[PDB]
Amino acid sequence: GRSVDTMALWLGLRAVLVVAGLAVLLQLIRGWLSSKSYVFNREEIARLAKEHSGLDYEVAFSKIIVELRKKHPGHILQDEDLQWVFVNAGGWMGSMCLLHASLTEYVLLFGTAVDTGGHSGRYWAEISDTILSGTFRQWKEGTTKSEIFYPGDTIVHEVGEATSVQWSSGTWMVEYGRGFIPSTLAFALADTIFSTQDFLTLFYTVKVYSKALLLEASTHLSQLG
Amino acid sequence: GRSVDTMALWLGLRAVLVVAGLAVLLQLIRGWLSSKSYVFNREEIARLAKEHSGLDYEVAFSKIIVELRKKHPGHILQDEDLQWVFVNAGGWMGSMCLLHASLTEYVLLFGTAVDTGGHSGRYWAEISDTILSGTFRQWKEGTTKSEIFYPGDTIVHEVGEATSVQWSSGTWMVEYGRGFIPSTLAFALADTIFSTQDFLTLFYTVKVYSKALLLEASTHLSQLG
Amino acid sequence: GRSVDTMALWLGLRAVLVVAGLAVLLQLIRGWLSSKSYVFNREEIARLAKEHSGLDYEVAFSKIIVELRKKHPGHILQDEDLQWVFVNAGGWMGSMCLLHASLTEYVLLFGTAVDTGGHSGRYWAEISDTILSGTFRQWKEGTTKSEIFYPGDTIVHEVGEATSVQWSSGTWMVEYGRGFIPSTLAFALADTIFSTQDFLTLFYTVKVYSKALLLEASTHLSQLG
Ligand SMILES: CC(=O)[C@H]1CC[C@H]2[C@@H]3CCC4=CC(=O)CC[C@]4(C)[C@H]3CC[C@]12C
Numbered sequence A, B, C: 001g002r003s004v005d006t007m008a009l010w011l012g013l014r015a016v017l018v019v020a021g022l023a024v025l026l027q028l029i030r031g032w033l034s035s036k037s038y039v040f041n042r043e044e045i046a047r048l049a050k051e052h053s054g055l056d057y058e059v060a061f062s063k064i065i066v067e068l069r070k071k072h073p074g075h076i077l078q079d080e081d082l083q084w085v086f087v088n089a090g091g092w093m094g095s096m097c098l099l100h101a102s103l104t105e106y107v108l109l110f111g112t113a114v115d116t117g118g119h120s121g122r123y124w125a126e127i128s129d130t131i132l133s134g135t136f137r138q139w140k141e142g143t144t145k146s147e148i149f150y151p152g153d154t155i156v157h158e159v160g161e162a163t164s165v166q167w168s169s170g171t172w173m174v175e176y177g178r179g180f181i182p183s184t185l186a187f188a189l190a191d192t193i194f195s196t197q198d199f200l201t202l203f204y205t206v207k208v209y210s211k212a213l214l215l216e217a218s219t220h221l222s223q224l225g
């Protein structure tokens, strides 16, 4: 009767429980033992973006790209491969311009010209965003109150952390990610697969990721000979 | 030619039509003949939340939990099992603290620290939300105009009804559901499966549901001996 | 080691790349060689909606429907088949009333009573929306700035184009689509399948599409005898 249905539902819930739990455990295991080859550090990127946050965010874009090319030659994409690509993830819609991406790091420009917001994602990667323009509202897990950050501030999305994020129209930021980068792809592409059906955007995303990987491989080969 | 393609599309549309129609019919059949064991009633919960809506919503949270424990001993989770868990569903993102959940009822605290909104869901369950803080905008099906509710009001999401819901930053409410509760899970988890990929949140959700079910089973066993 | 993982990821990315690329190529091939039987034209619909944008959007709805019935008898649904149906797509939620739909064209009323926004979709179809009330913000691909349109304006979503769209509460518009209409269905239903689980709305959507197709077939049969 009712007790039988309660017990059966409890059994199925425990099934889903152990499935999700072992998925989380595997994510932790793959992430912790992942490689950690670091060309950049988040403080360098944050300071460089903060210095230029008072300028027009596109002038700041240019200046930051030029500085990153000067300080890390061989690790930033040429002008021919820079492209603004929409990003639909976790219920929000923004756009990115990828500057660098390896197995363990990535650097990009990110933002939005529309009001948007949603789930931040939960992956084995430390993400950091320095606002050039607009406002970034972060609502952390386990709290009932949120915080709003402004140009020049840096929000650090910690490893394993999950938040709600919200950006206002005209919000632009410099983003640096460090960790097990491929484990973020499932989050970054899911709304494209199950919501937007925008396969050309998927094409653009994997194209720029592959080009960044090929640049890193080419620079590694040159550094070894 | 063109007529052939029109006819083929019409055939496939009629296929999808009868599939969805029989799905709706099965939802109605499972829901109507579902059990209706009721520990609470929506008027009791609404009045208790309305009385305290003028206080800070966290003080109200505490007072409502204490009253519910006093009036329904054995049917509310202990302090050790209370937890704020994100909820991503129907395009919106909020967070919940589950107080009670059986096969036929549930009681929780719900709200959001970000501006959000989306589809309410359509399930065989009567849902009711009493606002402690913020604003709740409801847009009913078949109308071109929406309504905004304020602290102390109660919105009743009727059985089989579908609306668009929208909450402003800092909106918090007491929610009571009555009907065939498991038929809501597919709606409550879908954005987690196909959008956020946040498997630890899924873990938390099934964990608290299972604990609430086990509490109900334990109290039933004690009441029978 | 690290180079092996980089190479394997590059291989898998190239796999996803060629899959998405050939999907886009097939979309282009199916769209270009698709039929182009045109009962309406977008300038006619835009001018008719612009003329009435200064009136209450429901009075405008009625006047536009009456004019479209007068000028295109046999191609607009009778009063008995008009229905407001929710539309959840690309992360946004609005509602539509379908007036006309064939293999190559469609005419509908669209809008929203909630603040919403998301991905526009990318399909082989030229879409055009004339605002009767509210505001329509369009953010085009490849740009960091967006534009806001007002009552009486027409936004043209070009074939193959992808934008972010955003509508404010109380925004209502007349929409005309021309191209390969079925290729939009996957976008229009995806959030229903993977997010809202609202199968009765899916039922309503395929029902009105099938009725519009049957009306077009019946008028074609009458015109041929
Ligand atoms: C804005 C944001 O949430 C970040 C978090 C993880 C980031 C992704 C990290 C992996 C990645 C590398 C690429 O080369 C393409 C862009 C993507 C897919 C990034 C897009 C922006 C993301 C999704």
Ligand SMILES: CC(=O)[C@H]1CC[C@H]2[C@@H]3CCC4=CC(=O)CC[C@]4(C)[C@H]3CC[C@]12C
Pocket: B087, B089, B096, B098, B101, B106, B110, B120, B121, B127, B177, B181, B184, B185, B187, B188, B205, B208, B209, B210, B212
């Ligand atoms: C806020 C909201 O829409 C409500 C409607 C149905 C509710 C769900 C009802 C079933 C359920 C019981 C649980 O024990 C976990 C929370 C959930 C999954 C509830 C989360 C909040 C929901 C999704």
Ligand SMILES: CC(=O)[C@H]1CC[C@H]2[C@@H]3CCC4=CC(=O)CC[C@]4(C)[C@H]3CC[C@]12C
Pocket: C087, C089, C096, C098, C101, C106, C110, C120, C121, C127, C177, C181, C184, C185, C187, C188, C205, C208, C209, C210, C212
């Ligand atoms: C508002 C919007 O984006 C438009 C773009 C393509 C449009 C769809 C085009 C195909 C279609 C025809 C129908 O008969 C049902 C409604 C739908 C499913 C339309 C709903 C509104 C859509 C989704």
